Amino acid sequence: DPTMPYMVDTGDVTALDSHEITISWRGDCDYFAVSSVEEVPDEDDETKSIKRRAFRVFSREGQLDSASEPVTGMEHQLSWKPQGSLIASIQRKTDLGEEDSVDVIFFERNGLRHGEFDTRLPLDEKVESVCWNSNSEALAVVLANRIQLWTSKNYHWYLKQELYASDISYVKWHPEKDFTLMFSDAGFINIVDFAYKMAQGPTLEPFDNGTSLVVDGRTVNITPLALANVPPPMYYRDFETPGNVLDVACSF
Amino acid sequence: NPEYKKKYLQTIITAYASQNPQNLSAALKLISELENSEEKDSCVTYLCFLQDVNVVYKSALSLYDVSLALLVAQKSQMDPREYLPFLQELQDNEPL
Amino acid sequence: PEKERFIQCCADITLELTDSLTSGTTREINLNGLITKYSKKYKLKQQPRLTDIINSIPDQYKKYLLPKLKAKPVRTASGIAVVAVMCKPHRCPHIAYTGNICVYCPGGPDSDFEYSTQSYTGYEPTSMRAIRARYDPYEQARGRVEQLKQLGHSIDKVEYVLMGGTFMSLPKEYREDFIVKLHNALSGFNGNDIDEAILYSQQSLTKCVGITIETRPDYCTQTHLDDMLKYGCTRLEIGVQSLYEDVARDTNRGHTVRSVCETFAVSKDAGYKVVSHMMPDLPNVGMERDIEQFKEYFENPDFRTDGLKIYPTLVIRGTGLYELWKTGRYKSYSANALVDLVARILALVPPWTRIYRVQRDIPMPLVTSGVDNGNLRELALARMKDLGTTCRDVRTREVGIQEVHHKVQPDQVELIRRDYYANGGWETFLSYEDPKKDILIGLLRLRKASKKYTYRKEFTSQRTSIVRELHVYGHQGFGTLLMEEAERIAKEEHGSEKISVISGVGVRNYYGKLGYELDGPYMSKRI
Amino acid sequence: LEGHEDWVKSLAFRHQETPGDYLLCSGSQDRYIRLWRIRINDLIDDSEEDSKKLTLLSNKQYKFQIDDELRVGINFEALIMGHDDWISSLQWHESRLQLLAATADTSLMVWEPDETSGIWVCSLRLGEMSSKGASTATGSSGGFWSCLWFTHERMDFFLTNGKTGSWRMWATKDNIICDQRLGISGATKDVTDIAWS
Amino acid sequence: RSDFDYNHLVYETRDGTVCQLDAEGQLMEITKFPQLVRDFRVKRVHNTSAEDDDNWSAESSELVAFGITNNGKLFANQVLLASAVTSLEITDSFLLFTTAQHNLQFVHLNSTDFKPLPLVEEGVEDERVRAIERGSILVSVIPSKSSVVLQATRGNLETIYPRIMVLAEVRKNIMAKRYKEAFIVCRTHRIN
Ligand SMILES: C[C@H]1O[C@@H](n2cnc3c(N)ncnc32)[C@H](O)[C@@H]1O
Ligand code: SF4
């Protein structure tokens, strides 16, 4: 029998979860999100209650406003995109084979899952937290010894940069000016700043084609606009790398 | 060049109809001067699409020809009762 | 007498105007005044109209003097006379396998209305025309085209719309009969076989320049798309109403958003053009999520459809929403709030997407609560001007409305080309436009048939670029320019060996002079 | 033959009651009818061309050889105006020079040559009783299909499809007084239930 | 980044000073800026006029660096030609920038001396400025096709053919005396 409703698929908790409650303010600072680990005596096999990770969204007056969708494998990560939508968290998704990849997931103020992107991180990698830029344009993912920068032009979240450090405690964004990240690497205060750049090929009139190269972490996509004006979410004959690319340039 | 007149007639017609003095006399003269019944009618249709049919028909009259006038008057929407007797009377009289 | 002097007044007016116009002379006093000076000798209520005098001109003079009163391109020059018809009332498919019908569709077969088709209230002009024709396609089409002829239009490119419920949920014989009847009422052929009807309509005068069939995402499978392309369909209209799955679930919608997106991809890869319906003020949405979904709609490269239809949620008696609005569970927006919301949404419409309509024309005396006025777009544009930003909609930048509303003429035409990625495909959007004044003169969409989703035996055989839509409104050799540039793109930019344009059966001859040969339901051309 | 501007719905030759010449009518979708004069050899009656008679192009005469010798000089003869809609069916008379035009505007009428100016006028017209074929609320485009026209002793019967599966009769004595006689009926689609009284 | 002609190399220091570099490895301080710029370009621009001096030659060279910072201000050797610009791209004989006033602005690269440009008032309607959709950032330029490729904020590419580039192509083809390739190219971009 064809049906409209979708099955329940109750959530659960992971193994590398950090059992500390976390709090995030949204950019307008009119609601805040609190994430915790909680166990519920669910109707599904009420004999033994199920422990998982959940969160709630409260108003500025402390009033509880919304609960969260029960997702199988949320972690202690949680951050609110300063635009005011898409609370960002992370998920293990470790039930069935080849479906196992830690992925950043999104939620709304209703706490109903809405969109995600698959971090190309190894399954066993430990992720400390996530963050958002001041203007909500870039999202930083922090791990034990490396930070990742993500952006999105057409919902295709690129891995723009990966800063390699030794021992990362916390990572912050500059509030008044975006693209200025700071962190504490092994007892050192480190400041990094970023700026958009067009990886342009030569524009010199003899044999030029606007060979714009876009980095996608392990990928380097090509677009010779003078040959095939491919819109950005697709690309023209990309090439790969062994690791995570930092920046690219094109020969004359 | 004879070849240009052979081929690029419609250019010359456009030129004659485009100059502000509107040298339609030369245009219709050269159109009738063509020794054909296929291209000449095509050029007349082209001219009527380009230049107003009433003025071009008046110019055809002023060119002292009735056959060309009758050919044009089939593009002017006037009732044929209102010009066919006229063209017949013009046709069956002395030149002067 | 009362009216005879009116008839003879119209007669003398016609004869005198014909005599004056034969040698090329205009009138003086807008004949109605001259009409009265003779017909109102006793002033017995004789009130003529422009249609009245037009229905008096003799045939030989009528067909040649009529267009000398109208000059708006899309009105009488482009002549895409939108002629809407309706199918017999029937119950929309999902009701069977869910339990109840959509929770916001007013009217139908088992509402307080016994006569109106689903999602209709039997009071729109189309509904009275359908009933006075008893939902028969032949009478509907003949009457509408004849009413258009009477009102002085010189219509030559009839474009059909098949409104009312889901037309795709009917027995195949009935739909075949409906389409054959439409094409027959257009051309004049009196046959019964769909193949012959198409073949006849292709040569027909008063070309069937296309036909639109609003439907549902589930009923647009491969076989259904093959059926509608057999019919002659050129644009699809798909109900979406929400990108949030919870709203679709709570509205008894019966189709997931993922299904909608898949259908979008496969239909756009079948050469169609899709126009989607986008309902604001759906229950459990709120202004924040309304703006969110309308901002994502053009931002997610998966939907990005070429048309749009914003239909603010109107509650009407008898629906599933009256038993939920009466209890106060759901409260509508505010008039100012909704006007502002429409302003902000329209601020985000990209240049290629055309806003086909705004809030439904369901009568005010029947709506329980919703939009107050009936001129929502007027206030939306006024508020847009107040906010400073401006609209990029095709319909708000095309030449035809500007020449009569804005009264602005175009003088800086230039070639512009967008190139975006939608529904898994690379879609180019060529146009000739006015950069200084933002006036669109001609447009042409174009798509690279994606390997993932294309299925037509005409396309999977060799790489193909589809000219999904070509439209010229306001010398005038534009279609030629756009078509040539599209050829160049498909040869170099796309690397496609055969470029094929989907076309309404009426216009299939126009591409003949362009060197296209008819392959299946498309007008194709190898390269 | 050219002179029509739209599709040619129906056409019908007339009886060669005068050898060497007869009439052929062609009715279009553009609400026009055109009468063409077929003239066989020795009756072709050309125009003396050595003296310029100034013929119009629309009056072009098509001359052709059937085998090599029957020179046929078919020439346009008349333009019948004002049918208000398509001409679904047209048909001559047995003897008289009257042309029957059955149109799609729920109307059927009869033309004849004017006894004065040699042109054609509306001799008779029927179907003005309010109806629209498959509907009846408003008429105007949606009535009469094919027509038959046959004369008994002194009775010009007109027989016409009513776009509802029912025939319509009109019997008229000489040319004016016409009255409806009984016709037949029947459904156009499948018949399902037959309930006896 | 590399030089405009790729025969050199350039860089910028945290001081705000832009310096050069060659294949051999010899540097020279190119210029300095009022503040360090988050992006820049370099060009040894030449000059020309109606009647060129030095026996009709354009060898009057000068190295210039066009830079842009976070505040939004374009610098051509310590001068402020425009403010609040979003992005730039230089090319043979042209400099393009998006002025964040929803217009693309051209500067010909035939002046050794740079002086602040006029403001683009409302309705200027000139071959220099060109109207552009809001939020659009310039991405690339192909003079060989005379096509400026931008990318609007929502993320859909957009190729325009600005008036001045096709016009310059038309002129250079008129001198070249083809009258057909020039005519073909111009009629394609419906010209006058
Ligand atoms: C015809 C289009 O309008 C939508 N629709 C359904 N019910 C209503 C209503 N009450 N008001 C406006 N639009 C409505 C249909 O769902 C479809 O999207
Ligand atoms: S929601 Fe769709 S299927 Fe349901 S009644 Fe409305 S149009 Fe029909």
* Residue in the block written with tokens 């916001």: C104
Query: Rounded to 5 degrees, what are φ and ψ at C495?
Result: 65, 45
Q: Which residues contact A227 (CB under 8 A, 6 or more apart)?
A: A209, A236, C492, C493
Burial class for C519, CB neighbours closer than 10 Å (0-12, 13-18, 19+): middle
**Which of C260, C274, C275, C279 for mutating ligand 1's site (highest number of atoms within 8 Å of CB)?**
C279
Structure tokens at D19: 């050898």
* Residue in the block written with tokens 């020309």: E48
**Which of C90, C94, C263 for mutating ligand 2's site (highest number of atoms within 8 Å of CB)?**
C94
- Helix or strand holding residue C44 (H, E): none
* CA triple D104-D109-D112, angle to 5 deg: 135
Compute the distance between CA of residue A166 and CA of residue A144 in angstroms, rounded to an integer: 8
Amino acid type, D131: S
Q: Classify the phi-psi angles of A136: left when phi > 0, otherwise alpha if psi is within -120 to 50, otherwise beta.
A: left
- Helix or strand holding residue B39 (H, E): helix B39-50
Q: Classify the phi-psi angles of E128: left when phi > 0, otherwise alpha if psi is within -120 to 50, otherwise beta.
A: alpha
Task: Give the minimum alpha-carbon distance from D176 to chain C in angstroms, rounded to a whole number.
Answer: 25
Structure tokens at A245: 């690319």
**Known binding-site positions of C:** 92, 102, 105, 157, 469-472, 478-480, 511
Compute the distance between CA of residue C190 and CA of residue C181 in angstroms, rounded to an integer: 8
- Report the SS3 class of residue C179: helix
Structure tokens at C46: 């004789």
How many Cβ atoms are within 10 Å of D154's Cβ, its own excluded?
A: 9
Is residue A191 less than 8 Å (CB to CB) from chain E? no
Structure tokens at C467: 């000219």
On whether the CB atoms of residues C270 and E126 are closer than 8 A, the answer is: no
- Report the SS3 class of residue C316: strand
Q: Which residues contact C344 (CB under 8 A, 6 or more apart)?
A: C291
- Report the SS3 class of residue C254: coil
Compute the distance between CA of residue B35 and CA of residue C384 in angstroms, rounded to an integer: 66
Is residue E160 less than 8 Å (CB to CB) from chain C? yes
Query: Rounded to 5 degrees, what are φ and ψ at C265?
Result: -60, -50
Structure tokens at C287: 């202004």
Work out whether strand A72-74 and strand A12-13 pair parallel, antiparallel, or are unpaired: parallel
How many Cβ atoms are within 10 Å of C406's Cβ, its own excluded?
A: 12
Q: How far is CA C162 from the centre of its chain?
A: 10
> What single string gives the DSSP state of each residue in E67-79?
EE-SS-EEEESS-
On whether the CB atoms of residues C94 and C105 are closer than 8 A, the answer is: no
Work out whether strand A139-143 and strand A127-132 pair parallel, antiparallel, or are unpaired: antiparallel
> Using a 6 Å cutoff on CB, does residue C165 contact ligand 2?
yes
Q: Classify the phi-psi angles of D35: left when phi > 0, otherwise alpha if psi is within -120 to 50, otherwise beta.
A: beta
How many Cβ atoms are within 10 Å of A2's Cβ, its own excluded?
A: 9
**HEC readout, A91-157:** ECCCCCCCCCCCEEEEECCCCCEEEEECCCCCCCCCEEEEEECCCCCCEEEEECCEEEEEECCCCCC
Between chain E and chain D, are at least 3 CB pairs below 8 A?
Answer: no
* Residue in the block written with tokens 């879609």: C427
Structure tokens at E167: 């016009």
Tell me which residue of C435, C393, C398, C432 sits closest to C298, measured CA to CA: C393
Tell me which residue of C365, C361, C281, C276 sits closest to C321, measured CA to CA: C281
On whether the CB atoms of residues C473 and C427 are closer than 8 A, the answer is: no
Of C253, C417, C426, the CB nearest to A230: C426
Tell me which residue of C450, C442, C491 sits closest to C469, measured CA to CA: C442
Structure tokens at C202: 């292709």
* CA triple A130-A132-A134, angle to 5 deg: 155
Start-end of H helices in C444-488: 478-488
DSSP class of A224? E
Structure tokens at C497: 């060996």
Distance C103 CA to ligand 2 centre (A): 9
- Report the SS3 class of residue A202: coil
- Report the SS3 class of residue A52: strand
Work out whether strand C80-86 and strand C157-163 pair parallel, antiparallel, or are unpaired: parallel
On whether the CB atoms of residues D33 and D83 are closer than 8 A, the answer is: yes
- Report the SS3 class of residue C196: helix
Start-end of H helices in D83-180: none
Q: How many CB pairs under 8 A join C and D?
A: 37
Compute the distance between CA of residue A106 and CA of residue A86 in angstroms, rounded to an integer: 5
On whether the CB atoms of residues E153 and E135 are closer than 8 A, the answer is: yes
Strand order from edge to edge, sheet including E17-21: E9-12, E17-21, E29-32
Structure tokens at C104: 């916001």
Q: How far is CA B63 from the centre of its chain?
A: 8
Compute the distance between CA of residue C457 and CA of residue C469 in angstroms, rounded to an integer: 21
Looking from the CA of residue C108, the nearest atom of ligand 2 is 5
Residue D69: CA atoms inside 13 Å, Cβ hemisphere, count?
0
Can you name the residues that pair with E32 across neighbouring β-strands? E17
- Report the SS3 class of residue C305: coil
What ligand has the least distance to the C-alpha of C218?
A: 2
Structure tokens at C374: 């009936």
Q: Which residues contact C96 (CB under 8 A, 6 or more apart)?
A: none
Q: Which residues contact A202 (CB under 8 A, 6 or more apart)?
A: A208, A211, A250, A252, E6
Tell me which residue of A210, A121, A141 sits closest to A181, measured CA to CA: A141
Q: Which residues contact D68 (CB under 8 A, 6 or more apart)?
A: none
- Report the SS3 class of residue D151: strand
- Report the SS3 class of residue E51: coil
Query: Rounded to 5 degrees, what are φ and ψ at B20?
Result: -55, -40
Work out whether strand C354-357 and strand C307-310 pair parallel, antiparallel, or are unpaired: parallel
Residue C426: CA atoms inside 13 Å, Cβ hemisphere, count?
24
Burial class for D166, CB neighbours closer than 10 Å (0-12, 13-18, 19+): middle
Tell me which residue of A163, A183, A162, A176 sits closest to A133, measured CA to CA: A176
Nearest CA to ligand 1 atom 17: C239
CA-only gyration radius of chain E, Å: 18
Do you know the residue count of chain D? Answer: 197
Compute the distance between CA of residue C398 and CA of residue A80 in angstroms, rounded to an integer: 41
Angle between helices B9-18 and B39-50 (to 10 degrees): 30
- Report the SS3 class of residue C81: strand
- Report the SS3 class of residue D3: coil
- To one decimal, the resolution in angstroms is 4.0
* CA triple A59-A61-A64, angle to 5 deg: 45
Tell me which residue of C182, C138, C190 sits closest to D133, measured CA to CA: C138
Distance C239 CA to ligand 2 centre (A): 8
Burial code (b: 16+ CB inside 10 Å, e: under 16) for B10-45 equals eebbbebbeeeeeebeebbbebbeeeeeeebeebbe
- Helix or strand holding residue C296 (H, E): helix C286-297
Q: Which residues contact C407 (CB under 8 A, 6 or more apart)?
A: none
On whether the CB atoms of residues C211 and C229 are closer than 8 A, the answer is: no
SS3 breakdown of chain C: % helix, strand, coil, rounded to 5? 40, 20, 40
Compute the distance between CA of residue C3 and CA of residue C46 in angstroms, rounded to an integer: 7
Compute the distance between CA of residue A73 and CA of residue A52 in angstroms, rounded to an integer: 8
Structure tokens at B77: 């929407």
Work out whether strand A50-59 and strand A64-66 pair parallel, antiparallel, or are unpaired: antiparallel
Separation in Å, CA B95 to CA A44, B56, B64: 113, 22, 9
Q: Which structural technique was applied?
A: cryo-EM
Compute the distance between CA of residue E94 and CA of residue A177 in angstroms, rounded to an integer: 32
- Report the SS3 class of residue C336: helix
Chain-chain contact of E38 with A249 (C-beta, under 8 angstroms):
no
Of D81, D82, D135, the CB nearest to C139: D135
Compute the distance between CA of residue E4 and CA of residue E21 in angstroms, rounded to an integer: 13
Compute the distance between CA of residue D25 and CA of residue C146 in angstroms, rounded to an integer: 26
Looking from the CA of residue C106, the nearest atom of ligand 1 is 10
- For CA atoms C395, C398, C400, C402, the dihedral sign is positive
Compute the distance between CA of residue C254 and CA of residue C217 in angstroms, rounded to an integer: 10
* Residue in the block written with tokens 């959007």: C429
Q: Looking at C36-190, which runs of residues are DSSP E strands?
A: 80-86, 157-163
Is residue D188 less than 8 Å (CB to CB) from chain C? no
Compute the distance between CA of residue C200 and CA of residue C207 in angstroms, rounded to an integer: 11
- Report the SS3 class of residue E168: helix
Residue C196: CA atoms inside 13 Å, Cβ hemisphere, count?
9
Looking from the CA of residue C321, the nearest atom of ligand 1 is 10
Q: Looking at C281-361, which runs of residues are DSSP E strands?
A: 307-310, 315-316, 354-357
Q: How many CB pairs under 8 A join A and E?
A: 66
Name the closest residue on chain D to residue B67, using Cα atoms.
D54
- Helix or strand holding residue E173 (H, E): helix E163-176
Structure tokens at D23: 């009439």
Angle between helices B39-50 and B53-62 (to 10 degrees): 130
- The residues of E whose Cβ lies within 8 A of any Cβ of A are 1-2, 4-6, 38-39, 70, 87, 89-92, 139-145, 147, 149, 151, 155-157, 159
* Residue in the block written with tokens 């002085």: C152
Compute the distance between CA of residue C150 and CA of residue C152 in angstroms, rounded to an integer: 5
Task: Give the minimum alpha-carbon distance from D117 to chain B in angstroms, rounded to a whole number.
Answer: 14
On whether the CB atoms of residues C419 and E159 are closer than 8 A, the answer is: yes
